[PDB]
Design a binder for this molecule. Structure first.
Ligand SMILES: [K+]
Ligand SMILES: [K+]
Ligand SMILES: [K+]
Ligand SMILES: [K+]
Ligand SMILES: [Mg+2]
Ligand SMILES: [Mg+2]
Ligand SMILES: [Mg+2]
Ligand SMILES: [Mg+2]
Ligand SMILES: [Mg+2]
Ligand SMILES: [Mg+2]
Ligand SMILES: [Mg+2]
Ligand SMILES: [Mg+2]
Ligand SMILES: [Mg+2]
Ligand SMILES: [Mg+2]
Ligand SMILES: [Mg+2]
Ligand SMILES: [Mg+2]
Ligand SMILES: [Mg+2]
Ligand SMILES: [Mg+2]
Ligand SMILES: [Mg+2]
Ligand SMILES: [Mg+2]
Lengths: 60, 95, 128, 290, 283, 98
RNA sequence: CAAGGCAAAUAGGUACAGCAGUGAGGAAUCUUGGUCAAUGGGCCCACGCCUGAACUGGUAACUUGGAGGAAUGAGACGUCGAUUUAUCGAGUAAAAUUCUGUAUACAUAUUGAUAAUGACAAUAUGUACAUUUGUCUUGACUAAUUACGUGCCAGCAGUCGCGGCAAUACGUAAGAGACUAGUGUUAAUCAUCAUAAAUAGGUUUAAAGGGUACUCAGA
RNA sequence: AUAGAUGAGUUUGGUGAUGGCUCUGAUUGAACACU
């Protein structure tokens, strides 16, 4: 925050709304994104997160 | 609005009236809009199921408004309160 | 029907209804070009009476149909290229099409003032 | 290009109520019929009559297709909760009897007894209807050009639309040139002071000014578009009102869009010159546009 | 010659419509006249729309001093003058803009202000407490709370607002928690316990003053996390802002509303009706 | 060959990019393995800042990008310049001082 | 490798379902542009080269979004059409007056891009400009009227219908009701249609109970 | 996602049913006519 919030911005005074006071219906977004692959197994601690793993598979 | 749902049959003309929340409006056909707008109803949903005979649609609709489930009688019959949830929530009847 | 009868395929598509203009509905086309094989007159059925100006057109698809000529007076004749659209003459049997007035050879009603877009009539431009 | 729909904008024969401060409009509003004739009309003839009357005022400058989808079946409302009631009662008494509370004797017995029964416990201000039907055209109250006209910064909804299109309005300190911008709760729109004084000021008359050449307070300045000293437009008081979803500040010609218009029990916040009977038919028309 | 319809107009416009040509009184002068509740009706055919009063110029200043000089919490100034917190926050923003103009020597529209304020009804916050400006306890009618439910329960159950909230839904709250100044309930409960008014007011200020501390603390930590995620690299021309995010939060099927990136497998909606192509948020 | 590159999206005269992990020999805008972030080339300006300074908004999952650079991903020249500013790689080009 | 088409004959190429473009077919769908500046890709130690991928200019109301002007306007004691020739309308409409400077034009700056490279354009600011109406309907469904002409003729028609000499339904005139840079029509799809009913139908007399019930599979 | 469920014309001397047809709503990578 380099420039102070002027009195024109709606964020000049923060007055949070009470819960369940709005029912805005967001529109369904079309399209999808590629699901990033998993790098570790879902059970157990893999050898990839050990102490000397990088120094073993990428020596100097 | 009316109490709950009602379905009346008059000689192959079935009418189904449903109670709707406030602000729903009279989303009903033309002849039911007149009867509701005259009796003081403002939120209702109707549906003809079998026949749309002009005469029997008015007789079945009028008979349905006179055969609504009375919560005061349903409670004494079963021996249990039928609490008006919307009345307890706002502390009184919000017309 | 029972759940077993439905599982075996009792529900089938309802029998198709014939279209008003089959030559156009069959191929999803809004209009078709054709040559006039004959230009004559058709007689309405029982209730109505008069002479309906019709034309036997050979569509570009090969079908020969009978089209109604809307308006008062026409310009087409034998061996005349005209555009055909849907819609039928209700009192004429077999006349299941109309001819477009602003078509290739068929001209629009010249002395037309109301509903000119229906008869392919340019504006008189008398004001300009 | 003047379209055919704007020819008789203030017809004294048709008497359409328009969103402006014109003197011909004031006469049509004052002499409007107490109730349109819907005695023997069919359901369609009633919905079309109500749609024509209301659309002559609400969103007059918006196409029928754009408003057909801008129309929303969601009529917001609020209820007033008295802290004094919620602090003394937990709502159980409202479920006494058989679920709907105790029964009170009929009206033809109360007055018969000289002693009036004790006041029934309930939240104050209940059993009063809410005018939901009057909120049919609430979505229009969110457009920027309309909010400017409701803040009394313009003499008409069309004049306010020109202030926006001509870069004279500033929302949240940023220039806004889209009259269709839908204000959000908390937005602060500001109009140029010069355009407000001309829009709401009196016309610049040369004949009267010609006599005032030489013959807190203000002075004369013929180098301005409005007549000096600035005085309010004629008949402006008949249209002077600010709804409660706006917080206007005339010193700087700025206003804040506090919230969206809502319906309260016994009150509506949508300025509409038509009765619930007409707003109920207009609402029923736009359910299926037929 | 003028048509008879114009002749009737100017006749009415000079005899009965002359009272509106110029505003000489102090207050609203509308066609509908004073209503049954003391408020002016602008349109006679719509009795429900009324000309609600406005905060007078003096009242706006009083609100500015209590929130800026005296440092009282907004919830306290709201409950004190019966002004909604959303309006109190607006009166301050608008007043701050005046101080800018007065400081920058900009001329205020004083002629327009005075002439218009006379046309509108006004409330004077201070000595004369005639009526509250507005209801500060209006709760929003939630869709779930609008349904007609008649729940069967035992003949002698104590069905409270907590039980009613659950009858509408599992996630619904009672109106006791949907207030903008919920401290008023705890304040009213003190009076029931025969607590002196002077002490009840003390607990109310400390309650509101303490609630705003948490709100101001949440916002501070929030904005901090928004900055800790941004890496600002200054180049010779611009300042590159690298915002960090978790690229794995795309949902179980890749269709997540809050996912970051131009989604694949979707054409342009630029040919669809009711397509919004103007800014929807001027932040 | 895995590459950290940009997928040009947006409209005419309104460029918008996706930072993606895709095989080199594939279509530019084909569905990649992952979307690491976005990149907007047109510099923006703070709303209430009258100083005239501009900036560029770039969303990047640095943790996910470091893993791919570690296993042998080859970022393009544009993505290389971005990754060098955040402080992951060394610049490939520099302004000659002489 | 074979075959037919085009080219080729002592040859052995070609197939535009790569971009632009032509002919044909069709109711019907566009430029034989610029640049590798941006993004991507091939080759290269490097520099660099190539890219009808791509980015950009062009054509079409095909669609969507936006603009396409606001305020004042009372006796020009003028005009026009009906008609209870003095009533009802055109009509605040016009003229005129006071303002704005929207699309757009021009100019400056910034930006798309940086190690360097800008084909083309966006955004911002300043100055300047007030520019079209079109189309359908008008018996009922379905919002909206008369007069004349025509006389089961000419024609209208989505459904029911209209027209046979005093037609609100045809044609013309005026008015009125609507949408509007679009408006109608044709074609198609969903919904209407519990009108193939899983959710959720029905079969005495209206479409629909098998001539019969012992029985394998199946429920 | 808790507001979302609607009809109209037309068979009969007449009435109530059965059952199609058409209109009312939304739309198109549309075409045509008048613009
Ligand atoms: K039926
Ligand atoms: K080609
Ligand atoms: K390149
Ligand atoms: K009939
Ligand atoms: Mg027939
Ligand atoms: Mg006409
Ligand atoms: Mg080929
Ligand atoms: Mg051809
Ligand atoms: Mg490259
Ligand atoms: Mg190299
Ligand atoms: Mg401009
Ligand atoms: Mg290069
Ligand atoms: Mg009618
Ligand atoms: Mg016609
Ligand atoms: Mg006619
Ligand atoms: Mg358009
Ligand atoms: Mg049998
Ligand atoms: Mg047999
Ligand atoms: Mg048999
Ligand atoms: Mg019989």
């Amino acid at each position: 925050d380099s420039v102070s919030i002027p009195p024109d911005s709606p964020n000049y005074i923060k007055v949070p709304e009470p819960p369940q006071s709005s029912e805005v219906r967001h529109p369904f977004v079309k399209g999808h994104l590629p699901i990033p692959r998993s790098i570790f197994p879902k059970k157990g601690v893999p050898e990839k997160v050990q102490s000397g793993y990088v120094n073993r598979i990428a020596p100097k | 609005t009316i109490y709950g749902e009602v379905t009346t049959k008059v000689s192959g003309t079935i009418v189904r009236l449903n109670s709707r929340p406030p602000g729903f409006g009279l989303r009903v056909s033309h002849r039911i809009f007149e009867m509701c707008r005259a009796a003081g109803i403002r939120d209702l949903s109707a549906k003809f199921l079998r026949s749309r005979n002009p005469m029997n649609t008015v007789k079945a609709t009028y008979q349905a408004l006179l055969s609504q489930p009375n919560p005061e009688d349903l409670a004494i019959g079963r021996g249990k309160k039928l609490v008006d949830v919307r009345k307890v929530y706002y502390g009184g009847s919000v017309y | 029907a029972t759940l077993n009868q439905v599982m075996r395929g009792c529900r089938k598509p309802q029998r198709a209804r014939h279209a008003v203009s089959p030559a156009l509905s069959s191929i999803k086309s809004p209009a078709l070009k054709g040559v006039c094989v004959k230009v004559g007159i058709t007689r309405p059925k029982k209730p109505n009476s008069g002479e309906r100006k019709t034309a036997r057109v050979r569509l570009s698809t090969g079908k020969v149909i009978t089209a109604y000529i809307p308006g008062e007076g026409h310009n087409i004749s034998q061996h005349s290229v005209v555009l055909v659209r849907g819609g039928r003459a209700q009192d004429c049997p077999g006349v299941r099409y109309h001819l477009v007035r602003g078509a290739l050879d068929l001209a629009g009603v010249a002395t037309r003032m109301s509903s000119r877009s229906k008869y392919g009539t340019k504006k008189p431009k008398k004001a300009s | 290009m003047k379209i055919r729909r704007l020819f008789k904008y203030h017809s004294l024969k048709k008497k359409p109520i328009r969103p402006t401060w014109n003197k011909y409009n004031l006469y049509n509003l004052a002499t409007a019929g107490r109730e349109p004739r819907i005695s023997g009309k069919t359901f369609f003839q009633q919905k079309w009559l109500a749609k024509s009357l209301t659309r002559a005022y609400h969103g007059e400058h918006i196409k029928e297709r754009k408003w057909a989808r801008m129309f929303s079946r969601r009529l917001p409302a609020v209820v007033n909760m008295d802290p004094a009631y919620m602090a003394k009662y937990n709502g159980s008494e409202q479920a006494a009897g058989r679920g709907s509370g105790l029964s009170e004797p009929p009206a033809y017995e109360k007055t018969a007894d000289e002693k009036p029964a004790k006041q029934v416990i309930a939240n104050p201000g209940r059993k009063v209807p809410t005018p939901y039907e009057q909120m049919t055209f609430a979505p229009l109250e969110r457009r920027l050009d309309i909010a400017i006209f409701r803040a009394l910064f313009a003499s008409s909804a069309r004049q306010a639309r020109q202030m926006v299109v001509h870069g004279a309005v500033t929302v949240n300190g940023k220039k806004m040139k889209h009259p269709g911008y839908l204000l959000n709760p908390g937005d602060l729109f500001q109009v140029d002071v010069e355009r407000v004084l001309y829009a709401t000021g009196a016309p610049k008359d040369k004949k009267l000014l010609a006599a005032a050449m030489k013959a807190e307070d203000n002075e004369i300045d013929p180098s301005k578009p409005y007549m000096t000293p600035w005085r309010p437009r004629n008949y402006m008081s008949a249209f002077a009102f600010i709804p409660r979803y706006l917080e206007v500040n005339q010193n700087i010609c700025a206003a804040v869009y506090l919230r969206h218009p809502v319906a309260r029990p016994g009150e509506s916040e949508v300025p509409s010159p038509f009765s619930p009977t007409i707003n109920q038919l207009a609402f029923n028309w736009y359910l299926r546009r037929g | 010659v003028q048509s008879v319809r114009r002749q009737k107009m100017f006749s009415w416009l000079d005899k009965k419509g002359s009272a509106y040509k110029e505003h000489t009184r102090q207050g609203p002068n509308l066609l509908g006249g004073q209503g049954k509740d003391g408020l002016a009706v602008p349109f006679p055919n719509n009795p429900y729309f009324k000309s609600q009063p406005v905060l007078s110029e003096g009242s706006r200043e009083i609100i500015y001093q209590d929130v800026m000089e005296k440092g009282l919490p907004i919830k306290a100034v709201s409950a004190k003058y019966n002004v909604d917190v959303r309006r109190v926050a607006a009166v301050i923003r608008l007043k701050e803009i005046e101080k800018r103009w007065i400081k920058e020597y900009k001329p205020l529209a004083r002629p327009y202000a005075r002439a218009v304020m006379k046309m509108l009804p006004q409330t004077v916050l201070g000595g004369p407490d005639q009526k509250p400006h507005e209801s500060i306890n209006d709760v929003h009618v939630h869709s779930y709370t609008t349904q007609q439910l008649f729940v069967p329960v035992s003949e002698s159950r104590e069905f409270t607002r907590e039980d009613a909230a659950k009858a509408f839904g599992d996630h619904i709250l009672p109106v006791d928690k949907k207030l903008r100044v919920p401290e008023l309930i705890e304040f009213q409960k003190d009076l029931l316990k025969e607590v002196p008014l002077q002490e009840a007011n003390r607990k109310f200020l400390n309650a509101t003053a303490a609630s705003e501390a948490k709100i101001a603390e949440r916002e501070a930590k929030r904005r901090q996390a928004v900055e800790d995620a941004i890496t600002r690299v200054k180049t010779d021309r611009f300042e590159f802002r690298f915002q960090e995010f978790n690229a794995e939060n795309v949902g179980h099927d890749g269709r997540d509303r809050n996912a970051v990136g131009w989604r694949y497998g979707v054409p342009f909606p630029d040919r669809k009706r009711s397509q919004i192509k103007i800014p929807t948020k001027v932040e | 060959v895995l590459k950290l590159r940009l997928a040009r999206f947006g409209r005419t005269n309104a460029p918008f990019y996706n930072i993606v992990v895709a095989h080199a020999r594939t279509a530019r805008n084909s569905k990649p393995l992952e979307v690491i972030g976005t990149y907007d080339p047109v510099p923006k300006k703070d709303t209430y800042d009258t100083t005239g300074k501009l900036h560029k908004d770039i969303k990047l999952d640095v943790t996910r990008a470091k893993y791919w650079i570690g296993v042998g991903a080859q970022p393009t020249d544009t993505v290389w310049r971005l990754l060098s500013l955040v402080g992951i790689l060394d610049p490939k080009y520099k302004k000659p001082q002489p």
